[PDB]
Design a protein around this ligand. Structure first.
Ligand SMILES: *CCC(=O)N1CCN(c2nc(=O)n(-c3c(C)ccnc3C(C)C)c3nc(-c4c(O)cccc4F)c(F)cc23)[C@@H](C)C1
Ligand SMILES: Nc1nc2c(ncn2[C@@H]2O[C@H](COP(=O)(O)OP(=O)(O)O)[C@@H](O)[C@H]2O)c(=O)[nH]1
Ligand SMILES: [Mg+2]
Length: 158
């Protein structure tokens, strides 16, 4: 049984914790301590293979060095968090000395109306990085499994 080391990064308040908690426990957390950084484990079957996911919810050096894939999370109603994504990717590139790192761009809070980041904008950013873009709602669970499992499938191409 395989293990995949995943790291969830992005600006404050985008839903890093809510996404991770939704994935693990199938529950939307209305407020989760913004200072709690911890790693969580989750047994999954992905394309017929039993895997143990090891997920760091950032809020650390060891996981950046050995982490195999990163979720770059912004919120679709938080333009600053989207603009911040560049800086998070630059930090990952430095720690990995590579711009060929498994990553998925995640636009969270898709259940909220009147988005300020268009899907097109995010698709264009992900295209420039050569990575997938996936929209999620930690509230409704839409796309949550897709985001984490796609990151696994990106790691497997590596
Ligand atoms: C609401 C609280 C919250 O969720 N936070 C998330 C973690 N975090 C954070 N802040 C931050 O300034 N950097 C960072 C550093 C330390 C240096 C340069 N740039 C940045 C940002 C602007 C990209 C964070 N950097 C990382 C990170 C490192 O250090 C290495 C590789 C990959 C990374 F994502 C990180 F995980 C969190 C950073 C604050 C906002 C609190
Ligand atoms: N409506 C909605 N709210 C969300 C979603 N994800 C997170 N939130 C809310 O956004 C706030 C910040 O979420 P949190 O997980 O703590 O963000 P973090 O700082 O990146 O860990 C919380 O009040 C969450 O309830 C979502 O998909 N939809
Ligand atoms: Mg958090």
């Amino acid at each position: 049984m395989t293990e995949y080391k995943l790291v969830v990064v992005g600006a404050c308040g985008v839903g890093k914790s809510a996404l991770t908690i939704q994935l693990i426990q199938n529950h939307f957390v209305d407020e989760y301590d913004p200072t709690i950084e911890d790693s969580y484990r989750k047994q999954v079957v992905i394309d017929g293979e039993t895997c143990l996911l090891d997920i760091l919810d950032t809020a650390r050096d060891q996981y950046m060095r050995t982490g195999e894939g990163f979720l770059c999370v912004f919120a679709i109603n938080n333009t600053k968090s989207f603009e911040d994504i560049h800086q998070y990717r630059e930090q990952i590139k430095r720690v990995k000395d590579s711009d060929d790192v498994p990553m998925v761009l995640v636009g969270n809070k898709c259940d909220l109306a009147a988005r300020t980041v268009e899907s097109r904008q995010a698709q264009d950013l992900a295209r420039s990085y050569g990575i997938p873009y996936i929209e999620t709602s930690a509230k409704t669970r839409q796309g949550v499994e897709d985001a984490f499992y796609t990151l696994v499938r990106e790691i497997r191409q590596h």
